[PDB]
Amino acid sequence: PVSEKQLAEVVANTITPLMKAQSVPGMAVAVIYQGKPHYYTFGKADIAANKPVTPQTLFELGSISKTFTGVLGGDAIARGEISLDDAVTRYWPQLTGKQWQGIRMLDLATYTAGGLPLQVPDEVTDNASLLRFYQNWQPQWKPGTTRLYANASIGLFGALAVKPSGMPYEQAMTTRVLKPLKLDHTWINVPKAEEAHYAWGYRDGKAVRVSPGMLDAQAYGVKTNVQDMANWVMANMAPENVADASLKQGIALAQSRYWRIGSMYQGLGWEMLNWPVEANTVVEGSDSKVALAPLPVAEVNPPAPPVKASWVHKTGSTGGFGSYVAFIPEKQIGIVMLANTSYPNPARVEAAYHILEAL
Ligand SMILES: *P(=O)(O)CNC(=O)Cc1ccc(I)cc1
Numbered sequence: 001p002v003s004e005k006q007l008a009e010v011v012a013n014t015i016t017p018l019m020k021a022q023s024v025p026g027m028a029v030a031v032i033y034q035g036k037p038h039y040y041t042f043g044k045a046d047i048a049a050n051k052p053v054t055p056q057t058l059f060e061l062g063s064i065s066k067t068f069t070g071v072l073g074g075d076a077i078a079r080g081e082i083s084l085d086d087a088v089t090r091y092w093p094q095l096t097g098k099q100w101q102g103i104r105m106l107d108l109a110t111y112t113a114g115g116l117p118l119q120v121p122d123e124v125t126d127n128a129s130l131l132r133f134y135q136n137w138q139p140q141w142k143p144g145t146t147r148l149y150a151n152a153s154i155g156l157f158g159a160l161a162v163k164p165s166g167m168p169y170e171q172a173m174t175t176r177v178l179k180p181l182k183l184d185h186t187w188i189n190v191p192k193a194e195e196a197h198y199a200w201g202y203r204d205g206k207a208v209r210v211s212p213g214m215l216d217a218q219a220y221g222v223k224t225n226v227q228d229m230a231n232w233v234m235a236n237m238a239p240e241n242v243a244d245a246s247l248k249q250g251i252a253l254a255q256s257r258y259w260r261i262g263s264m265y266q267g268l269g270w271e272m273l274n275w276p277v278e279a280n281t282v283v284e285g286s287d288s289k290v291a292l293a294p295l296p297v298a299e300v301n302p303p304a305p306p307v308k309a310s311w312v313h314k315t316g317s318t319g320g321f322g323s324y325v326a327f328i329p330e331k332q333i334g335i336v337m338l339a340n341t342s343y344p345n346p347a348r349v350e351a352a353y354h355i356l357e358a359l
Pocket residue numbers: 061062063064151210220315316317318319
């Protein structure tokens with residue numbers, strides 16, 4: 001294997017047209033091919049300041065942050081601190097509403113609680129209002145019957161999962177996930193010293209960065225560079241190489257199949273499809289019309305351990321960023337696409353599929 005010059009061509013040929021069509025300012029790309037990460041960088045991080053995109057440029061991950069939440073939860077499970085079968089109420093006893101009765105930790109993690117909203121209401125700014133919000137929520141469906149992708153669901157999962165540890169979320173994440181994996185440039189809160197590397201997102205011509213929100217850290221607040229992200233993919237595609245025993249298992253727990261929703265499988269943060277899969281299947285499923293809709297689930301009990309022959313992926317966006325990650329453990333290939341403009345899901349998926357198709 002080589003084709004290095006061929007590889008650089010494949011990427012350029014796919015990304016070049018993408019940036020022109022969706023008018024993306026800058027993009028950092030990583031292709032993992034036979035245990036070796038390959039970095040590609042394009043455009044600008046900061047238009048005004050005319051700063052180019054570099055392997056050290058920090059991007060906002062949006063929903064890709066949920067894969068971190070998934071692994072942290074997995075690790076806690078693996079440590080014995082938590083169980084997917086546990087009642088939510090075991091961790092948050094204040095949640096006295098009769099409606100919380102049959103809801104488990106698993107439901108929160110996999111969006112099956114019964115219709116918790118996509119977003120935490122903007123009116124919620126503190127513990128009091130947060131508690132209130134959850135206490136008054138009226139489920140539209142019964143637990144374990146319908147999947148409704150929501151921040152308010154996995155957001156709470158993450159907040160609760162770290163209780164037994166005694167450490168606040170950001171601390172638990174750094175200590176148990178980042179440190180061990182040597183993800184030294186992965187932040188929840190970017191330090192002053194690193195700020196020079198923090199790119200500007202672009203929306204309606206305006207430069208923008210993500211704002212603070214309740215459960216932001218747990219659902220969409222991670223910031224990284226293409227370097228750490230590539231290392232994240234590698235750790236997930238080949239967990240046998242992870243030294244920490246609970247982390248190792250945590251990763252396997254996050255890639256396990258808990259529910260069946262047509263052709264896709266819901267993991268902890270991660271979403272999977274059986275490989276081989278047709279492009280249209282992946283692309284079509286990524287559109288908001290499908291991705292954000294309430295759909296019936298089929299339980300996988302016991303949960304199926306990770307399948308090598310899968311298409312593991314996750315899309316993520318912020319007001320001004322658009323990211324995508326995909327890998328096939330069987331083939332030892334992966335891709336990372338970080339952009340500073342939020343462009344349609346389908347286009348990210350199509351682009352990633354095509355490069356990976358050059359297997
Ligand atoms: P996910 O699929 O990447 C989607 N992203 C987020 O919900 C979070 C978000 C949405 C709107 C703004 I403005 C900021 C963050």
